[PDB]
Design an enzyme around this catalytic site. Structure first.
Site, PDB file in Angstrom:
ATOM      1  CE  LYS A   1      47.113  43.138  44.803  1.00 26.15           C
ATOM      2  NZ  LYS A   1      46.466  43.348  46.118  1.00 26.15           N
TER       3      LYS A   1
ATOM      4  CG  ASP B   1      49.262  45.020  47.072  1.00 21.65           C
ATOM      5  OD1 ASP B   1      48.785  45.649  46.101  1.00 21.65           O
ATOM      6  OD2 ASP B   1      48.619  44.803  48.120  1.00 21.65           O
TER       7      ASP B   1
END
Lengths: 442, 442, 442, 435
Positions: free
Chosen positions: D123, D163
């Protein structure tokens, strides 16, 4: 036990005779030193030392002038990087094999270490025979070899050089191809021509260095070249420049030779005589006999200079050119020092006899390292991106030879005279061993 | 002519006996083909073919459980990249040397070619002895080996695999370190576990492949597994899944064995029996004797299966397990076909007996190639980033084995039956040769 | 504005206590200069300057002597490369965290810049605790850490060194693994041993450099070490070689000390005396008091040297060893100069007292930089592929100190005496800032 | 023991509050499993699992539209490469910090594992605030970010995605700069547009997969979507294609919803009308005279299958009591954690099948896996081929949950999903040794 160690290591390479005899030579000399210094037996050091870090064997395919496709074998033995990048020449000869290259690479390791320069040890080559090969055939072979070898070399990885079969021309072709393939102009080969990063003093380095070391050894034992009768064998690169620097030190150099005769000049070589000699020899047409005839000098047909009474003998021709038989005449004729310009020109027995007779003996392992030392100077000059005047290269080389001598003295024993065979073997080992110990189990 | 070529090539490797034998073997059967097809002799094709593109020999240093530093030798023979990346297993055994790895790498080159998959030929390993070593010692050895080897491998360069002394555990250790050092997750090893990119059907691949090929062989010559008595030696994954597949083809499989003895079941293996045998063999000390007891079956302590009259024999145990004496028995009892699941189980003497007696003979070189074919399929699935169902891997493996069989038949002659030793050698040669000629002099 | 800036910067790292302190200190030091030189605030310079170029945090997994797997955290903070490759030590201590390494890396950027050498700023380490660990454990840990770290480092990228928990042994372990993984022998670590590219003068450097700098300062202000009464505190590495160099300039060094007390010798240290102090302090139980007793010198139990009237004071023991009370004495006794050998030995208040009374004051960041400077010389020698004799390293070191002296004078104002606190602070910042401005938005 | 491990892990990060919560939540669900399977604690497995392989923190300096130089911080958390290259989105939001990125990257590891695709866990992001920024500012930020980031990514190394704050536009700018700097066109980002390597079925993925998983769950327990009545909450991306696919299976989908309320339809959704919902829920409601409800949830309706596709904690206890009294047979989470933990227990002991979001809503990640596969294949697949591969994947995830879902009268998919994700990561870590 020396014997169980040697036997144990030969198990991996039971038919590598040259390598076997090479490990035995070094290990026999080091053994007593090891038993007095526990530091140098831990971390399975000897086993690590005799097993090369990496060997690359590879196929070289090329096309001859009759358009026949030829297949040869090549190797780069990357023996030790403990002190610096792998360093050592390339040899092209039909007798070349891995046993020979390992023996050679094993020995370059200690020799380079001895120079005090940051150089590791390697050797490479091919069973390619340059004999009777056209310039083009050689160029194509060199290029074909580099299309594989280039990925394994580098300025801070592996920097090769010349050797038998691989002269300036071959170094030129390999370096050119390395540069083309890598798009990188850093120093990956030494022995370069002066037009593309070569170093001054390279031709003179081995012979000059031999004289430098010998003078230190003589000076330490209360002597000098000054006014001494010097015999040189050979009339090649090494002999030629050994003669040159000997003359500058005030010695009377009374011989040189080629593979069939020896010229005697008790008056002594001069600059003019030597130039005229370097010439006649440079062609291949020319013979030492013709030089003698030209200057009206005594010529010994089929003979070496070892029967001539001298203070200092410098064998600069080839291996095993000076045996106990020759050692006896020299000793009887009052020789005070013997130093090796060629590689292993003195037989073990003669070497033993010399040391027993109180004759100073400087082995090639230290004495002829001027060449490799100057190879390190070439790398340095390239690194600095600035070329050096001849006088500063020569001076630096001289300083190196004095440090080699000093290291030999430190480990050469308490005797009235230094044992340079012992001294040089131990000095070379310690620098390598110390680096390996420091850098962990890798 | 043949002798002259084998004498010439041996000059470079005078003491590599296993390699000389491998070459002798391949060339001898290739020779008549080459006389009828001289284009495959053009461009010094043979000379190029027997010399590996490159071999890396390297030192491996590691620490054992008693904190003693150990030194081992390792290699990677990258024999051929003509058809694709070097491909073949790693072997950890004290007998490992360059001769053996070259012989094995040479044979992997032709086997991979045969599979029609885009794979080259390679082989590597070390004299490291896994016997008696702890998991920690094996892991540290594997990791030490990779700190050098990782730089020479790559998903499109060289993808190794398991072999003697290198099982799944070791492949996992080496792939782990490869991934760590490279910061790259691409398929560099085959034989991976399912958790990290391994392939379904891997365990079954060799045995399944043997049966698929053998059935294709039988069908060509007017027969099939259906109704046939089949004897199997071995009781590891190869033997196990050969039984499983033979059973599906309607065969009566009446034996399996280990180093201690042979179980005999004239009523034939069933799904439930085999399943229990698999459970038993997967334990550390499970024996065929235990299996035999559980099912009230005849057990021949210390005997092989070969004196039992059968229609088909499938040696799936080990090298040289099927010898002259054994062959006499099988032949006299009316064996119709022999097919190799293990690596060279049939001695050359016994192979010749089978062929001369009109017994169909499928050499492992072709018949056991299900394993390497499925390693190719592992690479395919890793490349696609999506794994296949077992049914998909199995159907693809089946097609490949039929393609292999077809190629052998193409080159197997026109006698009453196909010579598969001939066919397999020629077929593998042709693919590699075609590749080498098109890609020029490199 | 100052408070606003520090408040804003802390928003990204609300819990990095040590880093916040480092930023506060540096900016406070520079705010008056910044307000007079707004060019150094443009282009969001300060905002860019406090945010490190990159930080790698990474997992280190290793195995202890009990075969238990341990997990530690490591970092390399690559703070600034404006001036050259990231340069800075590695620290192994259980207290290590990002906040601490950023504070060390941020300060190191300016200290390195201050040397005038082409080095960026960096710092690294791990929470691995070397205490109670075996040589084996430390080696495996260093090697594990390098299996990730090697990819972020390089001779022209990032060149780490030792620090707390990381001595010559650990630097050897890391550099060895670096070389192994990279197949490249270029200088990636300083602090190397002499057998693999280390530099002479490294032990002498900090003390030698303190004296060179102080002499420059005195000379600019009409003075010199010659014939001056000099008091030295401490008796370790810095004090020893400061005494050594001061004696060469003809100073009368009249004290040394340890935590137990001070020896006073108004006749002055000599070479003989110094060699005895060193031999004595080389043993764990050896005390300054033993030296005093041996030579029949005055000894002051539990006292510092600062009561003794001197021309020059050189605190070389520890932080805050020289406070206001001591400052008053020195001043009233007529001290002419103070220069810092240890890390921040002079308290803020004592520093102000010295400056306000016209006592020359050389801050540690400038005065004790000899060590860092010699790491620059090690890099240089490796780059040149030649090791220098001690005499040459020493002279080159001297030239660096004069250059550091010059840098401080440039920014030290036009008062009757150069302000070196101000000068050292500004000069380091100005060179980083200039390089950042020049190299554009990156 | 669980408390001792959590406390010890926190020592290295005393202030990473979100990370501490993620670790606590994952380990809690696993501990009973761990106690029965000590193999998975050997080799300090857990201690290795919680410490990311590497984290890159880096400075991003860029120039805004007023010509002011701005400085932001960026990260890429490369948590686990055990099963494959690091994989996970990038997030641009001023609240982003290391703690948050570690929490998301840690959880992404097991979610990616659970899909059965060869994907590791990572991430990334930046405290850059996209809000009120021009296209030019956003582009310059993305390009400046990539002048550092490019060297840490790769097709077989780390493949990011979008995202919060990072949509198709930003993926476009990052992928473009990646390609330019590397002079390499291989797949390094997913979420790409259709003109440069993106995949079909992406919008439809999460909602389709939800139905694919639930149908597999139903059939294992002797049922299916056909003829059944299904309720859906939400009207966004997931809800839309969830309706479309469930219609395709023969379901009578009766509801949708937004923040403003919930729309009912006994006659069920049809194709032409779902399409009308998308364009525009009270507006759509008016256009059909359907039953509409203001400020309330769909769970008050008697249904056979319930698909929360709206928001977190949208299915509370009493709503579950409604559903259960009304005769619900299965619940499947489309949204992120829409069911509260008590309602989850109530459903499970009431004998109603329950599908956790980490499994059921995985079509999205699954399709990111399909994008990589198409790029690797050097082929684009038609929508039908993509959808067929997705369906296959969802069956594989279902299969994964069953095998660790126990031997009860019906599989425990909560337990099954939690364990299956962990075990595949743990197995891969065990096999690859101490690195």
């Amino acid at each position: 036990s020396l014997e169980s160690f040697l036997n144990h290591v030969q198990k991996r390479d039971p038919n590598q005779t040259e390598f076997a005899q090479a490990v035995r030579e070094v290990m026999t000399t080091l053994w007593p030193f090891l038993e007095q210094n526990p530091k140098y037996r831990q971390m399975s050091l000897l086993e690590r030392l005799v097993e090369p870090e990496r060997v690359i064997q590879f196929r070289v395919v090329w096309v001859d002038d009759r358009n026949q496709v030829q297949v040869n074998r090549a190797w780069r033995v990357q023996f030790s990087s403990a002190i610096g990048p792998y360093k050592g020449g390339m040899r092209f000869h039909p007798s070349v094999n891995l046993s020979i290259l390992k023996f050679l690479g094993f020995e370059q390791t200690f020799k380079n270490a001895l120079t005090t320069l940051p150089m590791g040890g390697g050797k490479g080559g091919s069973d390619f025979d340059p004999k009777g090969k056209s310039e083009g055939e050689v160029m194509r072979f060199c290029q074909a070899l580099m299309t594989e070898l280039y990925r394994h070399l580098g300025a801070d990885t592996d920097v090769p050089a010349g050797d038998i079969g691989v002269g300036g021309r071959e170094v030129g072709f390999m370096a050119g191809m390395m540069k083309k393939l890598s798009n990188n102009t850093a120093c990956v080969f030494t022995g370069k021509g002066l037009s593309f990063g070569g170093s001054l003093i390279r031709p003179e380095a081995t012979g000059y260095g031999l004289v430098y070391f010998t003078e230190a050894m003589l000076k330490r034992h209360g002597m000098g070249f000054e006014g001494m009768r010097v015999s040189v064998s050979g009339s090649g690169n090494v002999a030629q420049y050994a003669i040159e620097k000997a003359m500058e030190f005030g010695a009377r150099v009374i011989t040189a030779s080629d593979s069939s005769g020896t010229v005697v000049d008790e008056s002594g070589f001069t600059k003019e005589k030597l130039a005229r000699l370097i010439e006649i020899k440079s062609s291949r047409d020319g013979r030492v006999a013709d030089y003698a005839k030209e200057f009206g000098l005594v010529y010994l047909e089929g003979q070496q200079p070892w029967s001539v009474p001298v203070d200092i003998a410098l064998p600069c021709a080839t291996q095993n050119e000076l045996d106990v038989d020759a050692a006896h005449q020299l000793i009887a004729n009052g020789v005070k020092a013997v130093a090796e310009g060629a590689n292993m020109p003195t037989t073990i027995e003669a070497t033993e006899l010399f040391q027993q007779a109180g004759v100073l003996f400087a082995p090639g392992k230290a004495a002829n390292a001027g060449g490799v030392a100057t190879s390190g100077l070439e790398m340095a000059q390239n690194a600095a991106r600035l070329g050096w005047k001849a006088e500063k290269v020569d001076a630096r080389l001289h300083h190196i030879m004095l440090d080699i001598h000093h290291a030999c003295v430190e480990h050469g024993g308490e005797g009235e005279q230094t044992n340079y065979v012992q001294g040089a073997n131990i000095a070379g080992f310690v620098k390598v061993a110390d680096a390996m110990l420091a850098q962990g189990v890798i």
